């Protein structure tokens, strides 16, 4: 019984990072060394587990998190980072056990005149906790003056769009990111490599 990894990695559409997608994976076998042996990736790193010898353990669940960011932000998808993405959109915990996989999606997520459909959160009252998703579209109060809805002086819509056109520098091109988490509960281990 094969884990649905094709459905995470090869989806026509990926999420905006503020609204990052999560897929709970259980009761299946997955070949992870097979996944690593693609020439396709800018980024394939694993904390606490190894990509190569990934095929010998079981787990209660795997989570596959996916989203699109700028190339210059892929660095922010790691434990202990700071910036707009790690603070306000997608936060990994300090003790993260799992893999971060990223690749240039310029051919799919750019178009003539720019693709403006991918959004990120620019403002927030405080940082995300690890694995927090914030989907709220409440106007942000940047000054001592209240808002009550409405854009104005020191009162901003908290989401802003990337502007992905084919001609951008590679730090400004879209990257698709997949984060795998591996969790053990005192409870049946159901997601295994072939051993």
């Amino acid at each position: 019984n094969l884990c649905p990894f094709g459905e995470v990695f090869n989806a026509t559409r990926f999420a905006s990072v503020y609204a990052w997608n999560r897929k709970r994976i259980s009761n299946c076998v997955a070949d992870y060394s097979v996944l690593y042996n693609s020439a396709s990736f800018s980024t394939f790193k694993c904390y606490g587990v190894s990509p190569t010898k990934l095929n010998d353990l079981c787990f209660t669940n795997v989570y596959a998190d996916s989203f699109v960011i700028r190339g210059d932000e892929v660095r922010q998808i790691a434990p202990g980072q700071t910036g707009k993405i790690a603070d306000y959109n997608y936060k990994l915990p300090d003790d993260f056990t799992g893999c971060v996989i990223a690749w240039n999606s310029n051919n799919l997520d750019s178009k003539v005149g720019g693709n403006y459909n991918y959004l990120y959160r620019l403002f927030r009252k405080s940082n995300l906790k690890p694995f927090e998703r914030d989907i709220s579209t409440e106007i942000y109060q940047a000054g001592s003056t209240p808002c009550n809805g409405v854009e104005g002086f020191n009162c901003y819509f908290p989401l802003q769009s990337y502007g992905f056109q084919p001609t951008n520098g590679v730090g400004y091109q879209p990257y698709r990111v997949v984060v795998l988490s591996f969790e053990l509960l005192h409870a049946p281990a159901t997601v295994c490599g072939p051993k």
Partner: antibody
Amino acid sequence: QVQLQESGPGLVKPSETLSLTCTVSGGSISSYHWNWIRQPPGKGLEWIGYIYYSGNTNYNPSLKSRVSISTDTSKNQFSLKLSSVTAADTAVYYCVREMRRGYSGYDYWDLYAFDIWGQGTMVTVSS
Amino acid sequence: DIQLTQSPSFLSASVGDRVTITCRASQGISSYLAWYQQKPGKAPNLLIYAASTLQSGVPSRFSGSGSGTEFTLTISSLQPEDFATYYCQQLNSYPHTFGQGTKLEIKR
């Protein structure tokens, strides 16, 4: 403290291929990320390329068409080939190790300082 | 792609002096900056990484500071053995680039 030793000829004819190998002792090829650096006489440092034994490489764009870097995990080595050389390639060539990453695998968006250098080897391009 | 310029290019200073060498990046690089000391006929040697972390084995008279585009290597209390060429390196993005080197000679 891991030790790196460059070896290969100190003399290469113009238009031929410069070949160097770095033999590593004190740690494994597979635990680290490796680069080639060179220094023309009385000039600065120039980065040549990077390799992680997954086979993943990054080459200086100025050299990219002439450069090849590879690893051999069984002999605990990595290698450089610089094709069709001129006098402009005359230099001290250094193999280096990067500071250890807190993860396995690779990331084009993450770069590390060079904590261990070989002694360097002089290569002259001359007929 | 990212250019580094050091200043000064050459300097003589007395033993016991405080010496500052600067590195300018052509765009922001956060704290992604290393410094090396290279003595004649030797490999460069890593003094500082992440702009201000002292590498183990490096005497405490070397220190680094800065963020963004402006970076400083300080030698408090210059020693005769500090004769060398000093190099900054950016760890922001490929390609790896170095500054042009700052040659420090000891007055006596």
